[PDB]
Design a protein around this ligand. Structure first.
Ligand code: HEC
Ligand code: HEM
Ligand code: HEM
Lengths: 62, 64, 379, 49, 22, 106, 241, 81
């Protein structure tokens, strides 16, 4: 037997609230970045070539 | 160019053809006195409304 | 006691009002509006101060200053929109709080209710001035029309209207005053809210059933803190859905047109929150009769208590009451519809009957229905 | 008299992991705390953002 | 006792919080 | 002269009774009154059985209003059983009051 | 009390919640305003700040900005000796002050286009339908020359010269200048002038929707976690009686 | 004044409750609601729904008229005559 993913997670990080906070601090960081990266991408896909990001080419450095 | 063709198509549909009859009359069925209150606007607006609803959906796939 | 944090500091004991307070178990979701009502007021304040932190209270600049807020200032655009839509939510919430007082008879809390009315009228003053702040065509003409309404008073009125404005029209003086009043009002409001809380803390909440629930109480912290938080999530979701994807939707007035003191508001009208009153007002031919019956629409609330006729402070077990209660809500809906209507026949005759209906429902229908139900139950 | 007492059937409300009339819950529940605190954890982390 | 360990994780948290947050 | 009319109110009464849902909640009319000063005293005069019983039923009913579930069709208060048990108690309470008011005119 | 055919609900590229502005359209439509419109209508809150909002470079718009200050320059603002260079200067006022304006247009006062789409009732649908809407006076009707007849003006009249006609201008790329094709680009540049924040906002809406689709379901859980105690609870009443 | 031990008197009432962790937050998510949501909505609907229905008719009619009377610019009195 092994601990369910949760139980592993539990005994490594949540027993002590100090560890529990730490976790949350670090996940708040990591999560921001993926969310933004993913979420941004998603958005930018829906308006392909509509946004300057897509269009800076025309008048840029010749 | 674009706009001008689509408009016509729009007025070529059975409901455009049908309510253009109220325009057609009024446009000439005005008497001698020319009762200014006889203004043909009402009837025109109707036509225009239906023409444009149509226009918009089709006219859009034609531009840049 | 030793080292029981809460009772140690005396100040901290005063906060256990949100933890160890006995809270009815059974309790519709219409009980979160109170808590939402208070997040609203903090939200506005915050946001507000920020807007006030880059806004100028002059005829020349006001519109410009607003316009600057939502263009060259960083995130000044949401904050402002968030502020505007905020005030729709604060009213939306407001009417939910009262609907519940009406329905479950929470207004049995004589004293707590009274302060509620006071609160309700105090937010109305604030929303009426702030709208003026930007100095848009809509704001400029509605401020004139409404304050001039006051000149209906026979002996004083006229002099009065002029003192309020601080001149013969609504130029600088007027505008600068609203800013200051808008500013401090909400701080005054917060004291009231807290006195309101104070009186309710002596008797507790009422419930759907309409029966004492001391036999069934529950610690506020464990439960209701989660409920409140969730309700706030839902609250914030509605505010941002509206702010982020439908900015002016709700803000009926499109008038982003600096106010030219000689023009035509085709159909000038308060925002949604005040249409009932407006409608109510037009229905009367005479202008003084309209103001009094404008005042009574809103003040009527202070008599509800004295109109209560039944033995069941809870409408829940009373069907005829429920039916008229709802009617008046839909009547109230109907009245708001009139608010954006042209001045004409169709809307006049409709609005007239809706005003009558509205006082009938509160003044005469419901009370009778109360007795009838009580007789049916052999009470 | 107080002995004719019986705790209600809780089967419906309880779950999988701890539903075994005749077995330990100590080697079950370890995780069952972690899942629930996992939801909290997430909630907090998202709200932080 | 357990305070050092706990004060050490509490010190960590504040740190990473500032760093990131700020 | 009420034979037809007042033998038919029982029908609206009966219709009304179950129309007001307290019926369903395990509750009884007496247990639905507004708890004011007269009612309080009245309640305070209830014998232990009578009174513990109201406490249980409101404890049952508020339980249900919390969970939004109605009691079983089998287990619902039947109009024919209208224990107006508070009425007795309530009346005097009132009766004593009115006297006390009246004695206070002059 | 004349019916207004205000109903237009123009198809658009940013009609949708996630739908964003098409700057090429913005770009196009800018030129439209500058050549076809700049003449009588202003845009006061509009700085020369298209750069990133319009895909014009800083060097691009600096230069675009510069010539507008060379010919309409700060000499119409009151910078006696000002010429090319500056970027904080706002779009040049067609006339020194309003009163004039109405004289050049004979009593009418050409509305600042900055907010037009957001100001008047009906947004870029009406603006498009006005410009593209010009039809023959109705049998029996009279018109003062300035009172051209437009099918969507409240009072059923407008003092509006040929807003936009075919081959009025030419775009860099080659976009077919059709009265309407030009209008579609003009409106757009208008939408943006009214609400600069249009794109940020809708991206934000995306992130607020996803987030909220994670917190609403989580926090509901939290709420059942705790409440469970009460909702699962069962009662039992056992009098001595 | 203390709120918790002075609210009321209760005799003879036993209550049985379990912990969150041994339990599930969402037992029959949909099989309970459906029929509960259904059952109370059907007892609401009659009491609630009506006056809103009526408002909708009034809305509909009411706007019809308006557009007629006004659009029917000839409504009041005819042209020919
Ligand atoms: C000078 C000639 C122009 C030019 C180049 C444009 N407009 Fe337009 N416009 C002009 C006048 C004198 C008026 C006043 C009309 C009146 O008071 O009857 C207008 C009006 C408008 C409107 C009408 C809105 C309203 O008042 O309800 C709009 C929407 C408008 N102007 C926009 C507009 C746009 C987008 C233009 C460029 C493509 C444009 N105008 C050109 C005079 C002039
Ligand atoms: C608390 C009750 C409040 C209500 C109901 C309220 C409501 C409003 C409304 C409806 C507007 C009009 C904005 C628009 O539509 O353009 C406004 C504007 C404004 N409010 Fe508030 N507000 C409140 C509190 C405050 C507070 C506490 C402050 C500052 C201390 C404040 C400062 C401002 C300022 C400076 C403006 C002008 C700029 C703008 O229009 O956004 N308000 N408010
Ligand atoms: C600034 C505006 C207001 C704030 C901040 C506010 C706040 C609150 C709060 C936090 C509660 C406790 C939770 C609840 O009962 O929902 C409450 C209850 C109550 N409020 Fe208000 N409220 C406001 C406006 C009003 C108004 C306008 C009224 C009536 C006119 C009112 C009447 C009541 C009543 C009767 C109760 C108690 C009902 C009960 O729970 O039995 N409140 N209020």
């Amino acid at each position: 037997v092994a601990p369910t993913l949760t139980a592993r997670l539990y005994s490594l990080l949540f027993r002590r609230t100090s560890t529990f906070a730490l976790t949350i601090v670090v996940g708040a960081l990591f999560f921001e970045r993926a969310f933004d990266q993913g979420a941004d991408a998603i958005y930018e896909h829906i308006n392909e070539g509509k946004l300057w990001k897509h269009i800076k080419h025309k008048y840029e450095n010749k | 160019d674009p706009l001008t063709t689509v408009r016509e198509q729009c007025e070529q549909l059975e409901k455009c053809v049908k309510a253009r009859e109220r325009l057609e009359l009024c446009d000439e069925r005005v008497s001698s006195r020319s009762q200014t209150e006889e203004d043909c606007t009402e009837e025109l607006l109707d036509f225009l409304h239906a023409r444009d609803h149509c226009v918009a959906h089709k006219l859009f796939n034609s531009l840049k | 006691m030793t080292n029981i944090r809460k009772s140690h500091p005396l100040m901290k004991i005063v906060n256990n009002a949100f933890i160890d307070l006995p809270a009815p178990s059974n309790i519709s979701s219409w009980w979160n509006f109170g808590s939402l009502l208070g997040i609203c007021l903090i939200l506005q304040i915050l946001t507000g101060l920020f807007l006030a932190m880059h806004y100028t209270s002059d005829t020349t600049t006001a519109f410009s200053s607003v316009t600057h807020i939502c263009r060259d200032v960083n995130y000044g655009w949401i904050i402002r929109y968030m502020h505007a839509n905020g005030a729709s939510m604060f009213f939306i919430c407001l009417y939910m709080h009262v609907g519940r007082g009406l329905y479950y008879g929470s207004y049995t809390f004589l004293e707590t209710w009274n302060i509620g009315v006071i609160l309700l009228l105090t937010v109305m003053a604030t929303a009426f001035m702030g709208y003026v702040l930007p100095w848009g065509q809509m704001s400029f003409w509605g401020a004139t029309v409404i304050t001039n309404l006051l000149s209906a008073i026979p002996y004083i009125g006229t002099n009065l209207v002029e003192w309020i404005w601080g001149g013969f029209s609504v130029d600088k003086a007027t505008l600068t005053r609203f800013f200051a009043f808008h500013f401090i009002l909400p701080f005054i409001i917060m004291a009231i809210a807290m006195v309101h809380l104070l009186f309710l803390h002596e008797t507790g909440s009422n419930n759907p059933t309409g029966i004492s629930s001391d036999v069934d109480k529950i610690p506020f912290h464990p439960y209701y803190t989660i409920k409140d938080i969730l309700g706030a999530l839902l609250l914030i979701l509605a505010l941002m859905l509206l702010v982020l994807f439908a900015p002016d939707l709700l803000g009926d007035p499109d008038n982003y047109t600096p106010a030219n003191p000689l023009n035509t508001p085709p159909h000038i009208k308060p925002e949604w929150y005040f249409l009932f009153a407006y409608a109510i007002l037009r229905s009367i031919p005479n202008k003084l009769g309209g103001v009094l019956a404008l005042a009574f629409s809103i003040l009527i609330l202070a008599l509800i208590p004295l109109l209560h006729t039944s033995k069941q402070r809870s409408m829940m077990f009373r069907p005829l009451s429920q039916c008229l209660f709802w009617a008046l809500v839909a009547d109230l809906l109907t009245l708001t519809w009139i608010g954006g209507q042209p001045v004409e026949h169709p809307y006049i005759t409709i609005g007239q009957l809706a005003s009558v209906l509205y006082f009938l429902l509160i003044l005469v229908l419901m009370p009778t229905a109360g007795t009838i139900e009580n007789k049916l139950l052999k009470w | 008299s107080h002995t004719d007492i019986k705790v209600p059937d809780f089967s419906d409300y309880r779950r999988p992991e701890v539903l075994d009339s005749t077995k330990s819950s100590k080697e079950s529940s370890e995780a069952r705390k972690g899942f629930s605190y996992l939801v909290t954890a997430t909630t907090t982390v998202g709200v932080a953002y | 006792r357990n305070w050092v360990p706990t004060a050490q994780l509490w010190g960590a948290v504040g740190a990473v919080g500032l760093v990131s947050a700020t | 002269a009420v034979s037809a009319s007042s033998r038919w109110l029982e029908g609206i009464r009966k219709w009304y009774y179950n129309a007001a849902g307290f019926n369903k909640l395990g509750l009884m009319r007496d247990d639905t009154i507004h708890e004011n000063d007269d009612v309080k005293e009245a309640i305070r005069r209830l014998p232990e059985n009578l009174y513990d019983d109201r406490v249980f039923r409101i404890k049952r009913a508020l339980d249900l209003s919390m969970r939004q579930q109605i009691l079983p069709k089998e287990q619902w208060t039947k109009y024919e059983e209208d224990k107006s048990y508070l009425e007795p108690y309530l009346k005097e309470v009132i009766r004593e009051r009115k006297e006390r008011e009246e004695w206070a005119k002059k | 009390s004349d019916l207004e055919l205000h109903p237009p609900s123009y198809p658009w590229s940013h009609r949708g919640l996630l739908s964003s502005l098409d700057h090429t359209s913005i770009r196009r439509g800018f030129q439209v305003y500058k050549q076809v419109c700049s003449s009588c209508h202003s845009m006061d809150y509009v700085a020369y700040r298209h750069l990133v909002g319009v895909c014009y470079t800083e060097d691009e718009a600096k230069a675009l900005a510069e010539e507008v200050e060379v010919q309409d320059g700060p000499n119409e603002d009151g910078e006696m000796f000002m010429r090319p260079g500056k970027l904080s200067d706002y779009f040049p006022k067609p006339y020194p002050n309003p009163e004039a304006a109405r004289a050049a247009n004979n009593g009418a006062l050409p509305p600042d286009l900055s907010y037009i789409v957001r100001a008047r009732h009906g947004g870029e649908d009406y603006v498009f339908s006005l410009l593209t809407g010009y039809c023959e006076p109705p049998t029996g009707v009279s018109l003062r020359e300035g009172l051209y007849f437009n099918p969507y003006f409240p009072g059923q009249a407008i003092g509006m010269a040929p807003p936009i006609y075919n081959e009025v201008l030419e775009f860099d790329d080659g976009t077919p200048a059709t009265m309407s094709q030009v209008a579609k680009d003009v409106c757009t540049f208008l939408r943006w002038a009214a609400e600069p924040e249009h794109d940020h906002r809708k991206r934000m809406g995306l992130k607020m929707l996803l987030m909220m689709g994670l917190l609403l379901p989580l926090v509901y859980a939290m709420k059942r976690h705790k409440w469970s105690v009460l909702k699962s609870r069962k009662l039992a009443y056992r009098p001595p009686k | 004044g203390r709120q918790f031990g002075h609210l009321t008197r209760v005799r003879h009432v036993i209550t049985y409750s379990l912990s969150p962790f041994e339990q599930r937050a969402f037992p029959h998510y949909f099989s309970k609601g459906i029929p509960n949501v259904l059952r109370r909505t059907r007892a609401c609907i009659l009491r609630v729904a009506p006056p809103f229905v009526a408002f909708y008719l009034v809305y509909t009619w009411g706007t019809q008229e308006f557009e007629k009377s006004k659009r029917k610019n000839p409504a009041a009195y005819e042209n020919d005559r």
